Ligand SMILES: Cc1cc(N2CC[C@@](C#N)(C3CC3)C2=O)cc(NC(=O)Cc2ccccc2)n1
């Protein structure tokens with residue numbers, strides 16, 4: 023049983039939810055966590071979704087080495103310096119990302135416009151060795167991801183791909199994980215080092231008021247092509263720099279999903295990614311025809327699987343139905359199906375949905391289409407409720423004086439901004455200081471930073487001033503405390 | 506074009522075959538190679554096969570960290586000692602294998618016999634940092650693999666799983682990759698450190714006479730359970746050690762496939778793993794109805810894909826058909842389909858098989874079933890020819906005096922052996938010395954070691970003596986030079 027309340031001690035709630043559901047195990051190296059099958063299966067599902075989608079775009083998978091030489095990297099990094107006891111003459115780094123590993127090869131492979139576009143992806147893990155507090159799934163020292171890297175003859179084609187991938191990330195979060203996200207452009211201070219423009223999808227954790235970057239898609243432009251001499255010839259033979267993109271998304275997505283839909287009973291997993299969509303729990307009275315009940319459960323499982331419903335029967339005789347109900351609730355199975363002698367006699371089954379607890383009596387003949395309908399209802403309900411919480415979590419403001427009250431309500435702020443990079447640094451420092459003072463009156467950082475400049479922009483009145491500098495505002499920008 | 510001959514300079518042939526087909530790219534860290542899509546797709550195919558098969562056994566995937574603490578590992582390793590410039594207080598190692606990473610968790614997770622069997626697998630890369638000459642695919646410093654790890658209430662159930670997995674590895678090599686392998690038991694000196702009994706499938710490279718371990722499946726017994734205190738209670742409450750297995754297989758399999766089937770024109774890829782099974786090459790005379798020809802090629806592609814045949818049309822107008830024929834031969838596509846105006850007029854297509862060059866004229870209505878039949882014929886032919894070469898490569902001998910002649914014929918030897926571990930060390934040293942002398946008369950190591958003790962044992966006459974010690978022979982053992 024989960025016993026911390028999600029709305030009272032969120033940190034303890036999260037730990038209990040992911041440990042008691044058997045998703046994670048701890049490890050004696052800080053910032054690294056074991057992903058057990060209950061979590062890993064969800065990763066496999068979103069991996070298959072994204073892989074199928076980028077394959078349709080002509081992206082192909084590959085595998086590049088986990089090590090990068092010092093001079094290539096330096097053209098929060100873990101450095102290998104010894105094999106056994108023998109020092110290496112040049113230290114080598116574990117990849118935090120693979121631009122410097124892949125792009126010398128790109129420079130070799132690309133010669134003609136006929137070689138473009140080049141589109142590669144790899145599924146691997148990377149290491150970003152930071153000393154700040156790690157969080158299971160959300161912010162870890164090693165994490166699983168995919169990184170895609172493309173090169174194009176024109177900036178416009180590269181940008182179109184940046185946005186196509188960002189839309190795939192929106193679908194990963196909203197359509198698979200039922201997590202609402204906001205598409206936007208990163209600030210100059212927050213964009214990828216060396217890139218031209220970084221786009222992002224941002225999510226929100228209401229219980230601690232924090233934004234979090236859900237995935238990222240970078241227009242690198244010609245910057246890395248200049249760095250690595252990646253050029254192509256047109257048909258007349260003139261050499262030009264390629265235009266590049268890089269994009270990535272990680273197991274952070276699972277953590278965001280967990281935090282968005284979980285409740286006081288534990289996990290709630292959206293049906294579209296749940297490894298068990300329906301758990302069948304037979305009633306096993308000592309004084310019943312148990313073989314008949316179990317046989318009917320097997321028949322129902324076969325029937326549901328013909329509709330591609332993922333089913334598990336928990337026929338263990340050493341646990342009670344009440345124990346099983348709690349067990350699979352903690353694990354987030356979206357539907358429970360109960361079958362006992364009285365149901366058998368009626369030709370029906372009792373189905374309980376995990377998100378609301380509502381129960382249904384459903385005839386066996388109706389079971390497959392009704393459960394498909396119910397699972398789409400659960401998926402949409404999880405998304406719509408999360409989207410309403412996202413909406414309620416964003417305050418539209420006009421001046422910096424409104425920031426700290428809004429942050430104290432654990433909200434994000436949407437504010438007109440002049441987009442001066444110095445002003446973002448100053449806002450970060452000032453909000454951190456004010457947060458510290460408030461903490462001392464009270465008995466992760468308190469700084470507010472930009473999350474993104476949203477693609478969907480409210481109207482900007484003619485003389486609207488920047489909320490911090492008073493200079494002419496340029497765009498509406500989303501800010502908050504952040505991971 | 507490949508221009509080194511496979512039977513004249515095998516090393517150069519192999520390099521040309523894997524580079525000119527765009528399977529590999531070199532890298533500025535020795536022993537690490539980039540896997541380009543043409544190779545990576547084959548890895549994806551065998552990964553899907555093996556993953557589906559172990560899922561049917563109740564194995565579930567997971568992900569454990571790439572780092573292991575020094576004391577846990579030490580309860581050819583690359584050591585991380587710094588993040589940026591900050592030294593760590595305890596150095597941490599990159600996994601060469603994950604027993605010491607996973608089994609503390611196993612000890613925590615396993616409490617009751619009801620928790621058994623526990624069956625986990627992960628797909629990842631590992632690092633074994635050796636200074637010997639590396640070989641693309643076959644012997645690398647970092648390599649992709651899967652490692653499976655199971656725990657059972659009895660030794661017999663664990664052993665049954667060891668053999669079930671070994672059979673899956675036989676299917677991986679023989680049924681997917683059309684590479685014949687020999688199942689056997691490793692010698693005491695060659696078995697997994699800490700394990701009870703190691704089983705193996707061994708393959709053979711005729712051109713350099715070398716055996717190579719294709720995959721491995723270990724009965725760990727209770728040894729690691731003792732090391733890590735992995736115990737379970739029976740229903741009456743007595744604690745007993747679990748019985749464990751570990752097994753692994755790597756991208757080495759791709760290299761073995763390449764070496765087994767390739768020819769002087771380049772790669773030959775078995776249809777069951779070829780990412781392009783049929784390449785359609787339209788004839789594109791300037792004075793023809795090119796749109797009609799290309800339209801028919803599209804129709805044929807759709808028809809073939811309804812039979813799950815993997816098809817690519819090479820409709821590039823800037824290369825000749827002869828250029829395309831060579832291009833896709835070098836890449837190992839098992840079937841080429843040619844279509845020009847005269848074929849269109851006849852309602853047929855011309856199909857050329859990559860392994861033998863035989864051509865067929867096939868009606869469009871017959872195309873799908875005939876090509877399925879032809880691909881199964883190519884697959885079986887590749888396997889049967891490789892199996893005959895394996896058979897011709899093994900000499901059954903009686904005394905050590907016959908070893909060096911057989912090795913000079915680039916053969917393996919099957920010999921009666923007393924199985925004394927000291928005798929294996931002495932045979933290794935003696936054959937290395939004799940090889941060195943022969944080298945100096947002539948203008949990788951020359952040592953002969955055990956490859957395995959095959960499951961399929963010839964009859965052992967009553968008084969048969971060991972070929973090296975003259976003591977009573979115990980079993981027939983397969984020896985050769987080795988990777
Ligand atoms: C699990 C996960 C995810 C991500 N990040 C980054 C942005 C990104 C996005 N979008 C990546 C480009 C794809 C993402 O997901 C980052 C991380 N760890 C770290 O920064 C290291 C760390 C560890 C402990 C505390 C503080 C920092 N850990």
Ligand SMILES: Cc1cc(N2CC[C@@](C#N)(C3CC3)C2=O)cc(NC(=O)Cc2ccccc2)n1
Nearest residue numbers: 633635637639643644645648719720721753755
């Ligand atoms: C690609 C690949 C494969 C394998 N091995 C091992 C046995 C095994 C089997 N069966 C593993 C258990 C699964 C296998 O495939 C091993 C390796 N590198 C190494 O030993 C490191 C190395 C590098 C250069 C020269 C010498 C040694 N490199």
